[PDB]
């Protein structure tokens, strides 16, 4: 049923967890909706819009239209996986000589699983109708190409901020960029002065991040708070068998997530 004893299970789980935490970038700027569980299979992909300015009067009667929804759609939650093997002999050896089991393949799997999951958050597929940050509709684009000359650069960010405010969005912003422009931005040049990640970071106040998973000229700005975005989790990083083939041992690492942009207004891209 399962050869791996308790201690080996613990070792495997800790290794996959640790590499996951070291690896993910998307799950740092998105609060998660709780552990729904295995059984659940679809979630209330809820909102589209709505602003109720609200008011206060001494007595308590002002007729402000509350927000519940605009149109429910109920999309499902896909599954993310990768897999690896063990070569039974090592499982036996680690019970007499090499007491802590060798799991480099587990890290190999977890890294790729996290990479694919990140690609899912930052990009759709349209083969199951999942929208993504740089492909969604209602993104509030803005042309920006003036770079390779450090005499500028932030003006795109400030335009993004002002245009994101005009749709009634404030709060802690955040920036995520492709590595090409990221390395383009740390440059030290004539007029030296200072770098720019400190200026941009201060202006964003929730971190300028890196992702190799984007294209060559990408980059977005968000508004990290809840009641605008979310992350729906059924199961998180876990391992399980795939049977037992040729006396070897295969394995698989899972999780069922789904980005839901409740408020597809707080986005900006190229």
């Amino acid at each position: 049923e399962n050869p791996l004893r308790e201690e080996e299970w613990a070792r495997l789980n800790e290794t996959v967890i640790q590499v996951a935490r070291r690896s993910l970038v998307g799950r740092r700027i998105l609060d998660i909706y709780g552990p729904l569980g295995a059984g659940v299979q679809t979630v209330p992909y809820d909102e589209f819009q709505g602003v109720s300015p609200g008011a206060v009067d001494i007595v308590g009667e002002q007729e402000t239209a509350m927000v519940f929804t605009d149109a429910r759609k109920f999309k499902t939650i896909p599954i993310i996986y990768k897999d690896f093997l063990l070569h039974w002999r090592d499982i036996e050896a680690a019970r007499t000589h090499n007491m802590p089991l060798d799991v480099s393949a587990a890290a190999g799997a977890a890294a790729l699983c996290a990479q694919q999951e990140d690609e899912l958050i930052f990009y759709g597929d349209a083969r199951l109708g999942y929208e993504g940050l740089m492909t969604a509709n209602g993104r509030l684009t803005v042309p920006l190409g003036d770079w390779t000359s450090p005499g500028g650069g932030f003006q795109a960010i400030v335009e993004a901020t002002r245009k994101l405010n005009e749709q009634g969005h404030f709060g802690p912003y955040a920036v995520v960029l492709s590595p090409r422009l990221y390395s383009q931005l740390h440059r030290i040049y004539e007029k030296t002065g200072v770098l720019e990640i400190e200026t941009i970071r201060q202006l964003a106040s929730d971190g300028v991040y890196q992702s190799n998973r984007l294209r060559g000229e990408s980059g977005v700005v968000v508004s990290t708070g809840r009641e605008n975005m979310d992350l729906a989790v059924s199961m998180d990083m876990v391992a399980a068998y795939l049977g037992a083939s040729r006396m070897n041992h295969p394995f698989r690492v899972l999780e069922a997530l789904l980005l839901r942009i409740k408020h597809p207004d707080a986005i900006c891209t190229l």
Binding site: N13, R21, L24, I29, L30, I32, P35, A38, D236, V238
Partner: peptide, 12 residues
Amino acid sequence: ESHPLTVGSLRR
């Protein structure tokens, strides 16, 4: 409750 969270909730 149902298989507690393991990896998630980095910051926000």
